[PDB]
Design a protein around this ligand. Sequence first.
Ligand code: HEM
Ligand SMILES: *[C@@H]1O[C@H](CO)[C@@H](O[C@@H]2O[C@H](CO)[C@@H](O)[C@H](O)[C@H]2NC(C)=O)[C@H](O)[C@H]1NC(C)=O
Ligand code: NAG
Ligand code: NAG
Ligand code: SCL
Length: 551
Amino acid sequence: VNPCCYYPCQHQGICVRFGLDRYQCDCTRTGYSGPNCTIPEIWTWLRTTLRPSPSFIHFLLTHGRWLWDFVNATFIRDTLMRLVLTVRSNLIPSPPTYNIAHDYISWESFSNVSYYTRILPSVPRDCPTPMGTKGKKQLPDAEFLSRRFLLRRKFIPDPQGTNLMFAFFAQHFTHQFFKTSGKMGPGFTKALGHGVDLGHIYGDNLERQYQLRLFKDGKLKYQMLNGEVYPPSVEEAPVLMHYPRGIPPQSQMAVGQEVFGLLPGLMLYATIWLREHNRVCDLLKAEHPTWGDEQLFQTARLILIGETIKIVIEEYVQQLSGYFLQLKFDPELLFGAQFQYRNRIAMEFNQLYHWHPLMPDSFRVGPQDYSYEQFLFNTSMLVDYGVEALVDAFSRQPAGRIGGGRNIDHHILHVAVDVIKESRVLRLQPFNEYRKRFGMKPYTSFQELTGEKEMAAELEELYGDIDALEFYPGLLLEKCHPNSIFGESMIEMGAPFSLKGLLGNPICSPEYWKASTFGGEVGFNLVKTATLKKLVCLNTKTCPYVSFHVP
Ligand code: HEM
Ligand SMILES: *[C@@H]1O[C@H](CO)[C@@H](O[C@@H]2O[C@H](CO)[C@@H](O)[C@H](O)[C@H]2NC(C)=O)[C@H](O)[C@H]1NC(C)=O
Ligand SMILES: *[C@@H]1O[C@H](CO)[C@@H](O)[C@H](O)[C@H]1NC(C)=O
Ligand SMILES: *[C@@H]1O[C@H](CO)[C@@H](O)[C@H](O)[C@H]1NC(C)=O
Ligand SMILES: CC(=O)ONC(=O)c1ccccc1O
């Protein structure tokens, strides 16, 4: 039998088949040696024995308010942020490694970017079981597993007080780089650029961008309604949008991300950013009167990418982490370090980001409470209430807890189901194996996994062996910290993926991080000082309560 099915190689060592039945682990640069890369090197042993547990670190980061307040105001802040930035990233490989077609390095894997990459090779198609060596011959019925462990029974709010403003941001944001090609199958992505390219505002292809663009003052096309500014209609911006048959082009808003029409929350953020883009153009023009359309546009896009990356690090991630340490966005922190300014979206990263539990039972907008069947495709609510109106409403309603289990609304539970199904087609490796990839002890029992005995008990009869527990279910059912939005694994695995994909951008490089790049000091500060509040209020008549945290 395929020896690599036993996943013999520890610590990032590579399992290669040799002869008819042998195998060898390439322990190059893994820090360990031996047949399976288990014998540590002197420095490696020290490092691994002198590293406080993930939970301990988390502890230190979420306590000592008085302490941090003092640290955050010194240089230690920067020092730690850099540590975080670097340490966390070195986990994600770059240049990227494998994809759904190759479980080994290949020039194509590195060239063909329609491919999502993956951190761990697939479970060899010829292993005794679906997960490799352990578990039953057939995995739990996807749907059952979902109804039994992910379906929300009673709404469980996120203890960290995260709101829908955050939720919808997360959705809007991720959908600029998570765009699975329906025409190519799983593992493929129409979101080339694999990162924060703001393709969800400008489009994933030129023609579409060109269509979305006004080609005057560098501005982006738009339309006026009730005296306010909203994205143009599909009749004026003949772009392709995914709306249900029966809705005329004059009722569809063209934005950059085809799917964004299927939720006011999305189209909301779409409007906000469009608004901003246009505004930045104005700013740039006052400064550079000799500039043409292209450059005004091109520059304005770089500024928004900067802003986006800023707001995500200092307010969005901050929100999630709940850290007392003040996260900081400063491309310079890495100028001394060894870092590759490029990113390649991983399928595992895609899985992990399905945060559907955030969605509420219903959507409250003031005295009015809207249902899914009232929200999901409402092509007027946005224009009816207005940007400010919604931002105030979404900032006040709490999002649901992500980790914990049984907290996904039925209206959208069908997704978590496909996520599991897709996982198997992608032949993702076992949860534990991924745990190790991200420097964590594998779980020994389902009862160590979940914080309890009853659910674990059932998961055990179903999966057979904790070592068969799949990637997504593991992330979503794993026990949660004291009162955090999710578990250890979610943080330990996701943080690397998110920090790398944030700093691994060309504008974060020393070659790009110049003021000239953003049209001078004016444009540069726009980035250096961007904030969720400003992003909203500097583009709306009134200023509502805006924040990722419910008041
Ligand atoms: C009312 C709210 C929401 C609805 C109706 C919804 C619906 C969907 C649907 C239908 C898919 C496609 C999968 C399929 O064809 O079965 C999807 C994918 C996804 N959703 Fe949600 N979603 C919602 C909220 C969210 C939120 C809050 C997040 C968190 C950031 C999120 C993240 C994702 C991700 C990452 C994907 C994968 C996209 C891809 O692979 O291209 N969704 N969602
Ligand atoms: C990236 O890889 C995919 C799959 O390896 C390529 O698509 C396949 O192309 C071959 C020959 O053109 C066809 O026989 C298949 O039908 C295609 N399959 C899919 C999934 O579309 C794709 O051409 C590659 N992209 C580039 C530009 O290199
Ligand atoms: C290497 O791993 C294989 C499979 O798990 C095992 O049979 C073998 O005993 C291991 N060798 C060492 C020295 O750990
Ligand atoms: C859309 O929302 C408005 C209020 O924003 C409501 O009056 C109307 O009934 C909704 N239409 C739908 C989708 O049922
Ligand atoms: C210190 C650090 O990396 O924080 N990151 C996160 O909390 C984080 C962000 C996005 C997704 C999952 C996460 O766990």
